[model samples]
Target: SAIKPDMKIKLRMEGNVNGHHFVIDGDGTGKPFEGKQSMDLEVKEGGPLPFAFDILTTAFNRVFAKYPDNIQDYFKQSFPKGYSWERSLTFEDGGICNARNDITMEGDTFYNKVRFYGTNFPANGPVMQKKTLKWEPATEKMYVRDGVLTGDVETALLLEGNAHYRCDFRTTYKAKEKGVKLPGAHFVDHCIEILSHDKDYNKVKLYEHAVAHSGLP
Candidate 1:
């Protein structure tokens, strides 16, 4: 169905294009944080990384050590049968951006252990786009308790031949329904991206924390 204006879409998105970082989760508050701060201070002070996303890569690799299933098989698990969550947008210019996810469980933990792909169908266009996503989960006491899903994202947009923005980021998912197996549950996603390629190489960063849920009629 086409999304309409003033329909009250239940989604939250936050990101950055420079060194500034946005905190999606507030300081132990129940409400979301909608503020941005400079990461320059952290880099200048040479202090230990304080960003929540800094340790995502490490936490995303822990589940492999304990699970026996290979990545190929893990992705092939005939679970969900179909996706559970989806999000879409229909702009005034008639453009559309649509995305979906299928979450499944192996033990008490639920992960996105399936192959992820993309289409040129309005995620954003005009230039040729090459996108890729890999699904991998890690071990961490918080993951066991919170059921957060994790992964890596790599994508590039070719504007003129080979010139483009190659964006990279770490993603984490928190299901609205916690402490139980999640298949068709609404969830929130947090993505911290670094647009370190071409003119922006190592200079800019971006972040997005969004929510996806079952759509309405």
Candidate 2:
């Protein structure tokens, strides 16, 4: 059950993720380095749900076209976080989500101001499984269990007839310059959970999954 680090280190593991068996076994001998060795793996806190980016590119274009060309770049870079995502296929690797309500969750009714950030997990490279050298996420079948969204939204996109999806909201920038507010320089935050997704995420396939967005404004 335990090994002397003086020989090298101590650890081993076995797992059944989504009916898939994963086995990890190793000895403290013949490693790259020996004697009191230490092994650590990076881990993230959010569950990787199979939520497809699913919206049309035209939607992004439609939204961006509303802004001036001189400042369009500002949005493309999203000057803020505690965030979700704006998936356009590939390479914006991220971690978890954060939502600190300007007020507390139990304080009042719905529509209260929040400071949501799409970052809850620590930033790192290639998170590995604890006690092993394997990266669990790459092989694990991710499913949502109580998926909660948190973040702030730019005031421009928040305008009437502008907001299309709740994903549009995000953690924003502070007010500066006092002119035009630099888009994200001004914004609102909010948080919500998909109860159905939390309940049936693992039961359904990617094509069968759907989330309800009836409560937020």
- TM-scores for candidates 1 onward, in order: 0.23, 0.17
* Clashing pairs in model 1, backbone N/Cα/C closer than 3 A: 15-207
lDDT of 1 by residue, 59-94 (tens): 111111112212221111333231233333232323
Write one digit per residue (lDDT tens) for candidate 2, span 1-217. 0112122222222322222232222222211112111222111212232122111110110011122233322222321211113221111233333332221111111111322222322233221111111111111111222331122222111212333222222322221112322222211112111112223122211111112122235
For residue 35, give model 1's deviation from the true position in Å.
40
Candidate 2's displacement at residue 98, Å, is 2.7
Which residue segments of model 1 deviate by more than 4 Å?
A: 1-74, 78-98, 101-145, 168-217
Question: Using alpha carbons, what is the TM-score of model 2?
Answer: 0.17
Identify the leading candidate in terms of lDDT.
1
Q: Candidate 2: misplaced stretches above 4 Å?
A: 1-72, 77-170, 173-199, 203-217
